[PDB]
Write a protein that binds this ligand. Sequence first.
Ligand code: HEM
Ligand code: HEM
Ligand code: HEM
Ligand code: HEM
Lengths: 106, 106, 106, 106
Amino acid sequence: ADLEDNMETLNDNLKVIEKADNAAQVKDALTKMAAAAADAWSATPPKLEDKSPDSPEMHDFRHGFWILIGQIHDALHLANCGKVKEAQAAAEQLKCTCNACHQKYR
Amino acid sequence: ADLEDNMETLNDNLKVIEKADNAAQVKDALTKMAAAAADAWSATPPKLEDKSPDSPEMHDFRHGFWILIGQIHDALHLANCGKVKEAQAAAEQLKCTCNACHQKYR
Amino acid sequence: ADLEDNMETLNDNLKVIEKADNAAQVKDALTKMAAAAADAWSATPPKLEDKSPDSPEMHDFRHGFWILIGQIHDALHLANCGKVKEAQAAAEQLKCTCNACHQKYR
Amino acid sequence: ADLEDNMETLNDNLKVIEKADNAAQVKDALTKMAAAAADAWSATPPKLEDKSPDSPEMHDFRHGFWILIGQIHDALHLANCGKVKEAQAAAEQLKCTCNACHQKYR
Ligand code: HEM
Ligand code: HEM
Ligand code: HEM
Ligand code: HEM
């Protein structure tokens, strides 16, 4: 449940996908990432505890996970069609979104 | 005109967005990026020179511009509404799309 | 609460949007739709009752809500900016997502 | 080039996809649709000739094709992974977008 637990999962599985050598292994990893992203979406980070749940910052915070999940879902779709390398390249790119939210809210 | 020229407009303008003080500045920079992106769409990069107009590759390449185009269009909605900082955050996220395309194709 | 209840909120509110005279009306209706959509996300429809939590099906189903969520969020940006008619047009387009999910899963 | 030519192509190929019984035939059709949508995107419909090229109506007109192409690109991706029925269902759904733009601008 904890935001510091979803982030762990997110970081771990990224490593798993990088080392993967087949589609099934990538798919399995993308799925846990998807689930951790989904769960995180509903959280309040230490930096935004003082902000309106309805604030522009929390709509954006939640919107960053919306973007992530989307990109996880595209990566997953590549792995489901056997396209392993394309799906690992997509997972690699995920880090830019991770960073763009970390820069504003971590 | 050129692909290279399209890319310069894109890169110069992101900087103008980062440094902007007001909405009009960001709006003007996004409009020039929309026009560059649209123009770049029909280009063949030197690394896909030998591939068919209908290669998985050229379709993927065009699609990255489709994404950039939608992003810049959303940033623009923000700037037209005077939301300067959220437009600048949108530009930051936009970089990821730049980079993903450059990883595969530059 | 229920899936059925989530769907009613969704349907009632689209009507309020169509009939609205001003931005505040549309904004309020979109906020109630955002909340319904988020809640509906975790549900299992009676037609996917026998399928795994990780079936191509349940992933596809969740993804339709992901789309609706992003659409309603964009409509909301419009309404927060006072763009009443463009928000109402956004709601019209939004119906397609409703229908696509209902074709596969209702 | 003509807008009345892209619309024809768009309508014809839809019929082709409905009757298709295999992935290659669907893919071929989705590709011509993609090309006709791309070309249409740059046009001025009889109803908007008097509007600013920069108007909210023309940003939206162009934005309707952006949505279409996106959905064509997802349909295509299903066909490229052998998923024929899912890709024909996706092509069927395209009609709701066709209609939502026709309702405002045809
Ligand atoms: C694959 C994508 C991501 C990865 C691998 C990842 C990884 C991490 C890691 C390892 C930490 C803990 C670092 C520390 O203890 O100092 C962290 C924290 C954090 N992350 Fe992420 N992250 C990702 C995406 C995101 C996104 C999209 C958001 C926001 C929308 C986000 C928001 C945050 C915040 C606010 C913290 C600080 C946690 C705290 O103060 O308890 N992360 N992330
Ligand atoms: C706003 C985001 C973007 C920025 C800021 C950007 C920036 C640049 C710059 C400055 C260059 C050439 C100079 C150099 O070597 O650095 C370049 C080259 C290139 N870009 Fe981009 N770019 C962006 C988006 C894209 C996208 C979305 C695509 C494809 C969909 C793309 C494809 C390419 C290719 C293929 C080249 C090399 C072309 C050549 O060698 O002539 N870029 N980019
Ligand atoms: C704003 C758009 C939507 C509207 C207006 C809407 C409307 C409705 C209504 C009024 C019902 C139940 C009553 C009836 O039979 O008509 C319903 C049922 C249902 N909807 Fe939606 N809906 C929307 C979006 C969605 C989406 C996005 C999904 C999936 C991603 C979905 C999945 C379902 C399912 C599975 C049922 C049947 C549930 C049952 O039998 O208990 N709907 N919808
Ligand atoms: C698969 C999707 C689509 C199909 C099958 C389709 C089909 C058609 C057809 C058959 C016509 C001609 C009807 C007549 O002569 O009376 C037409 C016209 C038109 N379409 Fe579409 N359409 C699609 C999508 C769109 C979209 C997305 C837009 C706008 C963004 C659009 C804008 C228009 C307009 C403005 C006209 C009137 C043409 C004129 O006055 O010359 N269509 N379309």
